[PDB]
Amino acid sequence: PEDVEWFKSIPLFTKSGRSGFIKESLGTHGYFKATFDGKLSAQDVVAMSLYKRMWPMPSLPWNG
Amino acid sequence: TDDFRVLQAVEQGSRSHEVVPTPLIHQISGMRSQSGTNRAISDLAKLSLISKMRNVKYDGYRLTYNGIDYLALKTMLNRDTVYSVGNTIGVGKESDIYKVSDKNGNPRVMKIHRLQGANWMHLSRLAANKEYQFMSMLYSKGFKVPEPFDNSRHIVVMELIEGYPMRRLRKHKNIPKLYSDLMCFIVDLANSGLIHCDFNEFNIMIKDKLEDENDCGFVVIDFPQCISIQHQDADYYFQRDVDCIRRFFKKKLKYEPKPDSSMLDTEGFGD
Amino acid sequence: SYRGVDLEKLLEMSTEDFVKLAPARVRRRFARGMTSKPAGFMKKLRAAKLAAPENEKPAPVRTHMRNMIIVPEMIGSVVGIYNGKAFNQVEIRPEMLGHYLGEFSITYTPVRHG
Amino acid sequence: EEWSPHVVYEATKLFVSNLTAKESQKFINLILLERFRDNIETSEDHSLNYHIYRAVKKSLYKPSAFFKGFLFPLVETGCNVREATIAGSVLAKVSVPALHSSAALSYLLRLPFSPPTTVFIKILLDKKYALPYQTVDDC
Amino acid sequence: QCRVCSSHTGLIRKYGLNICRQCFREKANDIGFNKFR
RNA sequence: GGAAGGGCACCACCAGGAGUGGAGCCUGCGGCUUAAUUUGACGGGGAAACUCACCAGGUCCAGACACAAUAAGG
RNA sequence: GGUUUCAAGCCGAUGGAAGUUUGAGGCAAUAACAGGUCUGUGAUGCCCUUAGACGUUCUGGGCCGCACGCGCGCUACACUGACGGAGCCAGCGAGUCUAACCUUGGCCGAGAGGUCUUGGUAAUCUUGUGAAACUCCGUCGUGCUGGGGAUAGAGCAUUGUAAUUAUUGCUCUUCAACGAGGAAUUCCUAGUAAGCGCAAGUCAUCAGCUUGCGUUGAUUACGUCCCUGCCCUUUGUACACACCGC
Incomplete structure (x- = not known):
């Protein structure tokens, strides 16, 4: 449930593109109660995206 | 910055005419496509920040009390003021008083004024400006009185006093x-x-x-x-x-x- | 003293004689009846009292029945009363007679304003 | 017929898991069938609760008792479609020996035609057991 | 407790008939309490 | 069109009457707190059990048919 | 009898139980409701098909917690009043079966209450529901007082399996803010307001919850659109989108 609780600032996007924001984890198993745009069916994906900063990698000569 | 700037632009797209149609909020923003303008207006209307008046052959957009204060918050983002909003101590007649806090963490007082289409907003604006100038006159004369921070067009943010x-x-x-x-x-x-x-x-x-x-x-x-x-x-x-x-x-x-x-x-x- | 009675004289009393020294609430509580399962719980309680070393504290027994009158049979036991979430272990004193078990276990966190 | 469906569930478990094939036939045909038809008949939406469904599920452990007591006079008393779906899920979920399933199919194919009987025959054809040739000839 | 159609919302709990105010005005023309004044 | 004119109302005003907001407390909402203070905007939502829709736990019962093994000395 | 093209009609007065449409509410046809489900049917679309509890339980805490804000109510700030006696005035309801309802009466207890019965399935008994406010006579003597009753202590009883964060009732004691109340706010024209209690549903126990009933019974309008709005219209109009400085 702390996964739902401490991550509240990160917005909810549905896989159908519908935005939303969490209220809380309705269950202690991280089953959560959320408010969305519209009447979703049970088939879409409630999702978040988190980003790691990537960095370039070195190079070397190659004599055949 | 950018979305708040365009919301300031449609704030400035209010002091042109009466109840504003759809293509004026399309073009005063001056944005790229149908996407940004229409999805922004829908985000306004679903959060009750705007309303639709359809008077015959004429679409128009009616701003209620909701979709203003963000800009005031943006106006108070400019003037170093409040970051967190909401603690109810006192619902008065011509203002609603809240206890708020800045980025610095000191609690302050947020009197929003609700006194539509222009006149509710504008008379709340005149009330806030008049009370701010009266507070300025009292503090300039030297009366012991709360110190004003700002008067964000129609919402007065001031100090808390024990x-x-x-x-x-x-x-x-x-x-x-x-x-x-x-x-x-x-x-x-x-x-x-x-x-x-x-x-x-x-x-x-x-x-x-x-x-x-x-x-x-x-x-x-x-x-x-x-x-x-x-x-x-x-x-x-x-x-x-x-x-x-x-x-x-x-x-x-x-x-x-x-x-x-x-x-x-x-x-x-x-x- | 519970009614001006010495402690060890209180200790060997039955439940019904303690009802004979009880207030009106305890008397009318016991006069209507009691469940069969706290009898086996008291047998477990006295078995854990028989699992006590000399000159020390007995085995703590965890309890849910918060509405039970502390009868002088249970004086001296270390009892973990359940508050709805957790168990709190208190030694039963002769100062605790006539009370519910629910009076000795706080069920919620305090509210701090100022 | 004035019990609760929990009580009918527990009494069906008791009186099928202990009583014999003819005795639980009489139990289900007298006590479960009339309470069953009065729960569904006297209601305005004509559906059934979940624990009578569990009772009819637990009544199939002796299959002679189940088919000779539950299913066979019910279709002759008027079977509707909620009884079909509920007792067909009963007939599907519990593993039944093939002989009394075969006698049940031989019963249900002979009946006056009804889509409830079609649901029950459809459930008995979801088994694909080792049927005797008389049950195959009834098909 | 609604013992007819599981309709606890607005029981009329008086006299044990126990019909909700939605379905009580469905079955209002079966008992006899009708509109006079 | 931000012209003016009528209704016609004690959810408007005048004649007033009882008042609320003043004290204490009951009770509904918001806020805080929590492990939960279940959830709506009176919800027949009067209230220890139930109702309970919320927490701390402890548990049953799942899953049909097909299909490879396994057999009545098990 | 005024008023009205002296027309459909309005107003003042008389007779009338009733003379403002004697007053209120239900009823259609036409033109809006995705308004709220049916535990509906359809090789329907689609995440899984179940180790999920969605189903079940069983305990104990909650839903009541508190710097505060928004609001409705109860009780007061007393002498047109509190206490102590006496008189004892209604009405709407409501009541038990294959159960424990409404209870009369008699004894016990300071009471709470308890005992023993009896009547009533009801215009019959509870019931004449001998309610409260009210009437009279004494105590008080304006003093946060003998107004207030918040808070707290002690015990005793009742319903409930379970009364603890006290369900509630009874006895004694502890006697707080509160000296007619701001910015502002609500409702209202005759048995209406206001004061009062009672009965019925919430009712296992209690109301400060809701509804009907009856007792006592004012002031003052019977005018207005001046505020608050709500409409109804009349039409000056779209600059039919113009220039700019920006």
Whole structure:
């Protein structure tokens, strides 16, 4: 449930593109109660995206 | 920055005409495609920040009280003010008072004004500006009064003060000097040229610093009742202030005046 | 003293004689009846009292029945009363007679404003 | 017929898991069938609760008792479609020996035609057991 | 407790008939309390 | 069109009456707190059990048919 | 009898139980409701098909917690009043079966209450519901008082399996803010307001919850659109989108 609780600032996007924001984890198993745009069916994906900063990698000569 | 700037642009797309149609909010923003403008207006309407008036052959967009204060928050993002919003202490008539906090973490007071289409907003704006200028006049004259931070077009953000009203204050030790204070302060009001007719128990706010040094002050919030001395009925207004002080100090503090209190004819040789 | 009675004289009393020294609430509680399962719980309680070393504290027994009158049979046991979430272990004193078990276990966190 | 469906569930477990094939036939045909038809008949939406469904589920452990007691006079008393779906899920979920399933199919194919009987025959054809040739000839 | 159609919302719990105010005005023309004044 | 004119109302005003907001407390909402203070904007939502829709736990019962093994000395 | 093209009609007065449409509410046809489900049917679309509890339980805490804000109510700030006696005035309801309802009466207890019965499935008994406010006579003597009753202590009883964060009732004691109340706010024209209690549903126990009933019974309008709005219209109009400085 702390996964739902401490991550509240990160917005909810549905896989159908519908935005939303969490209220809380309705269950202690991280089953959560959320408010969305519209009447979703049970088939879409409630999702978040988190980003790691990537960095370039070195190079070397190659004599055949 | 950018979305707040375009929301400021459609804020500036309000001081052009009356109830604004759809393509003016398309073009005053000057954005790229149908996407940004239409999905922004839908985000406004679903959060009740805008409303649709469809008067025959004519779409139009009706701004309610909701989708303004963000811009004021943006206006207060400019002026170093509040970051966190909401704690209800007092729902008044011409304002709703909230306890808020800045980025710095000090709690402040957010009086939103709700006094539609232009006139509710604009009269809340005139009320906030008028009260801010009256607060400026009181602090410029030197009256002990809360210090104003800003007047975000129609929402006044000011300081919080540790005080409690006099109805729950039994007494103090220096009662006759408190009577001389609450006589001489109405004398100072008449020397300002004004009379605050609602000089009641709920008005006067006392901050309490210590019990040894006795370095404290007062807070007087009577803004839609201050009346200039030139008006028709200021005599018994002044006398109601004086006599409410005296009847409270007789009823609560059990104090009768040994010096005679000032009259209006006494204070006519003042300012 | 519970009614001006010495402690060890109180200790060997039955439940019904303690009802004979009880207030009206305890008397009318016991006069209507009691469940069969706290009898086996008291047998477990006295077995854990028989699992006590000399000159020390007995085995703590955890309890849910918060509405039970502390009868002088249970004086001296270390009892973990359940508050709805957790168990709190208190030694039963002769100062605790006539009370419910629910009176000795706080069921919620305090509310801090100022 | 004035019990609760929990009580009918527990009494069906008791009186099928202990009583014999003819005795639980009489139990289900007298006590479960009339309470069954009065729960569904006297209601305005003509459906059934979940614990009578569990009772009819637990009544199939002796299959002689189940088919000779529950299913066979019910279709002759008027079977509707909620009884079909509920007792067909009963007939599907519990593993039944093939002989009494075969006698049940031989019963249900002979009946006056009804889509409830079609649901029950459809459930008995979801088994694909080792049927005797008389049950195949009834098909 | 609604013992007819599981309709606890607005029971009329008086006299044990126990019909919700939605379905009570469905079955209002079966008992006899009808509109006079 | 931000022209003016009528209704016609004690959810408007005048004649008033009882008042609320003043004290204490009951009770509904918001806020805070929590492990939960279940959830709506009176919800027949009167209230220890139930109702309970919320927490701390402890548990049953799942899953049909097909299909490879496994057999009545098990 | 005024008023009205002296027309459909309005107003003042008389007779009338009733003379403002004697007053209120239900009823259609036409033109809006995705308004709220049916535990609906359809090789319907689609995440899994179940180790999920969605189903079940069983305990104990909650839903009541508190610097505060928004609001409605109860009780007061007393002498047109509190206490102590006496008189004892209604009406709407409501009541038990294959159960424990309404209870009369008699004894015990300071009471709470308890005991023993009896009547009533009801215009019959509870019931004449001998309610409260009210009437009279004494105590008080304006003094946060003999107004207030918040808070707290002690025990005793009742319903409930379980009364602890006390369900509630009874006895004694502890006697707080509160000296007619601000900015502002609500409702209202005759048995209406206001004061009062009672009965019925919430009712296992209690109301400060809702509804009907009856007792006592004012002031003052019977005018207005001046505020608050709500409409109804009349039409000056779209600059039919113009210039700019920006």
